[PDB]
Symmetry: C2
Subunit: 607 residues, 2 copies
């Protein structure tokens, strides 16, 4: 029970702020209503706090062991027991398509449900991502492939996304894994892939579906020459799903990692052990990188939600500790050797820290749920009034913030959680150091922060012609211009909005100048990450401010008890974030407006 849930804040966001309950009980969600939604969140939170979290420590202390001659991995018993708990409740099939055995629901609710597993034992969700991949394989497959996808979903097969090679990580287009077409239309995949998550998973599933990018012989270079292939660990009867002969795809190494140790991160050899790795061309078309980006988009959303979930149970652990730990006297009596001892929540610096953890943890939760409300065209219409096209664009703009800004912030602020515990924070007895170790990875896989920032500017803003960016900007400006108890917050948000507008203009300016002087484009790269983070802060402050507005109406209406405390905290957090986080964006804008290429022209030897 390391994991501390927060269903209350999830429901507040989903219903009182974004109004996702408006589509519940109607249309696609005809058979699921607001009170069923609340019960599902509560149920998976209890399961996460119990069976799923019970093996959080065990997985880290007792990580998988690799047998190099069987090419398999043994997982610790307690963690497998948690996996079965997850399956027995059917939680690998929330938001899964109905025709695959799923329960239809808005994606905002689905990701909120997944938050609890990511918070209690993130690697358990990664192992359990098979069905969701089967759906993507289904959506992209031939009719015949759709039958396989249905089988995989029903049978609970695991799955992997196979891109990375030793010399091709960020530069996916440099991968050299080959695909050799056979007369009967199958392909033989030949190469070595690296860092593949869940490439083997002990006896959790009867099969693993590997989705492998490979370059067909003679195809062009870059990502555009790449194709995607369904490569099952086991051959299987394509009508009954019956498991057959082993396919030539074998794990040949398992990495030793700083954290997330219970997730087998594997070197994967295809067609190197005298057995062909048979693959099937997904959709029987050559459109590899486009197809895998359906999966990359899911992976990036999960990583951000993972980091945010971890920060939130990090904060709540730090809060509970701070509440019971007595140390020192109140600052108004610090000169009195005999003054009463106080719990450390009385100390200004501990309070500064807890509110920093709170505001960012809750600000990020708002961000990922906000992002999710544009993932269904029909939730996007009901709660935002935007059509499918703008919704998709707005969702694509927000993903790199969820991933890039969520991974970086979660890890940073976990430093505060650990600090709240003093020296005991450095002990394994408490979960925060594992939170830190487990979450460090989130700035790296599924595309690094710099890649996130490069995606954000060039594709999600410039290639987008700024349409999504402008929609969100307009919603921020609308809130600013609408009581007076939020007068100061709106002023601080107006400054920050303008600050981000300034950054966007400078970086655009640097791009335009690259028409005349190629090197000018380096200035965009230099400021890309600071800009991504600046947008994340602006969204946090805006969404917190929205939450404070709802909290004041509900407080004004007579809220009492625990409700009253919750709403009071939202008001405090929005005000604290506006007054302590948002002003730094002013300086950041001024730094971006003055970037120069000195650091680019400097001789490498001078570093």
């Amino acid at each position: 029970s390391h994991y501390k849930s927060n269903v209350r804040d999830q429901v507040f966001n989903l219903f009182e702020v974004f109004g996702v309950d408006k589509v519940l009980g109607a249309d696609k969600f005809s058979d699921l209503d607001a009170d069923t939604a609340r019960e599902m969140l509560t149920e998976i939170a209890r399961l996460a706090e119990g069976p799923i979290a019970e093996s959080f420590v065990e997985g880290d202390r007792n990580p998988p062991v690799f047998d190099p001659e069987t090419h398999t991995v043994t997982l610790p018993e307690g963690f497998k027991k948690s996996m079965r708990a997850l399956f027995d409740g059917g939680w690998d099939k929330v938001g899964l398509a109905e025709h695959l055995g799923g329960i239809p629901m808005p994606r905002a609710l689905q990701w909120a449900l997944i938050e609890h597993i990511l918070g209690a034992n993130p690697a358990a969700y990664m192992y359990a991502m098979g069905p969701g991949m089967s759906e993507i394989f289904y959506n992209n497959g031939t009719d015949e492939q759709k039958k396989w996808a249905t089988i995989a979903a029903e049978r609970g097969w695991g799955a992997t996304m196979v891109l990375t090679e030793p010399d091709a990580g960020s530069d996916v287009g440099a991968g050299r894994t080959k695909a050799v077409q056979q007369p009967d239309g199958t392909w033989h995949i030949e190469g070595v892939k690296r860092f593949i998550t869940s490439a083997d998973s002990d006896d959790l599933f009867e099969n693993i579906m590997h989705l492998v990018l490979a370059r067909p012989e003679g195809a062009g270079p870059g990502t555009k020459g790449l194709s995607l292939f369904f490569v099952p660990k086991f051959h299987f009867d394509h009508e009954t799903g019956e498991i057959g002969e082993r396919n030539g795809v074998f794990v040949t190494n398992v990495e030793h990692k700083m954290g997330l140790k219970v997730s087998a991160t594997c070197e994967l050899s295809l067609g190197q052990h005298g057995i062909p790795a048979v693959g099937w061309l997904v959709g029987e078309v050559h459109n590899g990188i486009a197809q895998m980006f359906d999966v990359i988009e899911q992976a990036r959303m999960m990583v951000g939600t993972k980091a945010i979930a971890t920060l939130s149970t990090g904060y709540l652990n730090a809060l509970e500790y701070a509440k019971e730990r007595v140390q020192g006297a109140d600052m108004t009596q610090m000169t009195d050797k005999t003054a009463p001892r106080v719990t450390i929540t009385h100390h200004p610096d501990v309070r500064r820290s807890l509110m920093t953890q709170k505001a960012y943890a809750e600000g990020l939760r708002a961000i990922y749920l906000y992002t999710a409300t544009f993932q269904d065209a029909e939730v996007a219409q009901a709660v935002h009034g935007v059509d499918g096209d703008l919704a998709a664009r707005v969702n694509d703009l927000l993903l790199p913030i969820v991933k890039g800004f969520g991974s970086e912030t979660a890890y940073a602020k976990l430093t505060e959680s650990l600090q709240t515990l003093g020296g005991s924070g450095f002990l394994q007895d408490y979960p925060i150091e594992q939170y830190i170790r487990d979450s460090k990875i989130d700035s790296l896989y599924a595309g690094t922060t710099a890649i996130q920032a490069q995606d954000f500017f060039f594709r999600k803003i410039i290639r987008d012609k700024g349409q999504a960016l402008a929609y969100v900007a307009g919603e921020i400006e609308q809130f600013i211009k609408n009581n007076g108890r939020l007068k100061t917050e709106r002023e601080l948000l107006a400054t920050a909005l303008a600050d981000v507008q300034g950054m966007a203009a400078s970086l655009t300016g640097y791009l335009m100048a690259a028409q005349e002087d190629a090197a000018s484009i380096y200035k965009v790269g230099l400021g890309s990450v600071r800009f991504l983070m600046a947008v994340g802060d602006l969204l946090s402050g805006w969404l917190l401010a929205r939450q404070a507005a709802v909290a004041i109406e509900k407080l004004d209406a007579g809220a009492t008890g625990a409700d009253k405390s919750f709403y009071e905290g939202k008001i405090a957090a929005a005000s604290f974030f506006a007054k302590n986080m948002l002003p730094l964006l002013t300086s950041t804008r001024q730094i971006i407006e003055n970037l120069d290429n000195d650091v680019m022209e400097l001789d490498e030897a001078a570093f």
Copy 2:
């Protein structure tokens, strides 16, 4: 070679070309030690650190100490004990140790530069080796008879511990309840349980350990003032020949399991609970505990700061070497060309932003601790700064919480950039950076948490000091500012200096106003840590700019080759730090100028 990558070149630059410590070398107290000898010593211990000391860095983490309950002792891994012997055999126990205890006299600026290499290669190795330096502290505070014991302890190389912390008394040292009961023969029996004691046992590295234990004499008043300091040896011993006799009643009962620094045995220490008394001797036969122990704390705080700085330095140099070799992607000026030549990642603007950020903070921090060390000898302070002993002492005290607090916090933050430079591989144990992070997380906690450093900085080192040491340092910064290739830096430093003056004035205002409104003092707590960090950023900016000024002179004088490259990087680092770090202080001042106690008045339950 090793994980540990040294930087003797940058150390000698600071000691000689910037601060002119060589100007006291070869004469008087240091007459047996000239510039050439000092450098050869630095080169020598750098090689020891890169070889035998660093060799057991990984083993200490992977094969950590074990507590034996049958023996109440601790077992160390063989490889790490081999490193310890390498250190002892070289006589590196006694650099800066007083000559009458067998040490080599040297300026403290040189002493800590030598120690940086050990803290970089295997920091626990120095902690286990701090026995002799503790014997010197015991000597200076002890009676004549005790001076004889301390001489035996130094000569025979006994280990040592500082024993303050208890389960209910960490930062609040004065709340400790371990008691001392005076015996007829003038000795004392220490009775209590202490927590988190570094090196409380050390296997068979030494023949005895000197525990320096804070305890309250029966009947003494409360708080730190009621405490006394006691010499409590692991073994009784002949007070004149040093022959080791019967076991004393002070036993390790457990060894903690930690995020990092694993090879450092951190133990619960029981005094007089296993059936034999822990006999102790009142240090100096006076009741003056907390002042006496602070001789040790001041050393411990300097070591922790230098340790964090050492770790960032080798973290940065590891990331740089990696970035030089890793090919990934095309140059940004060719980003749309999928046939463009691949480049090494030092060509990517964000990688360069990240490397220059690591560089500037690493080298800026080395400058800070070496600058701080130039005020730890009266002779060096007068010769290189022209300040008397009293002022020097005050300026050194002012700078320690910056070395410790700002160094601790920055090192850990920027190691994130080091790990990020390796991409996914940074998450692997195959590379040392993830261990650097786990090993350095502790630096913000022991020897006083960052909040305690910030509280000490403002209340004792500025306010109680009447701003004299602070006014001296501000005067040197303003002198540099007033003196053209460094005009922009001096402009930005002027802004930064005023920004810190403002923060100081706001905070002083909040404190003085507590006379008429007690709650006003909470605003000091709310802003103290940010204020400490701003001074650290100001000092780094100043010192790097000073380094650039010497680098300009040296290139003007004709420097070539590797020298030229070094001086060029100092210019780039100084300008980059002034343009990308210092401006943020303006927003931080404005934030400190509008702190309020909303966060203090909020109900705990609203968190």
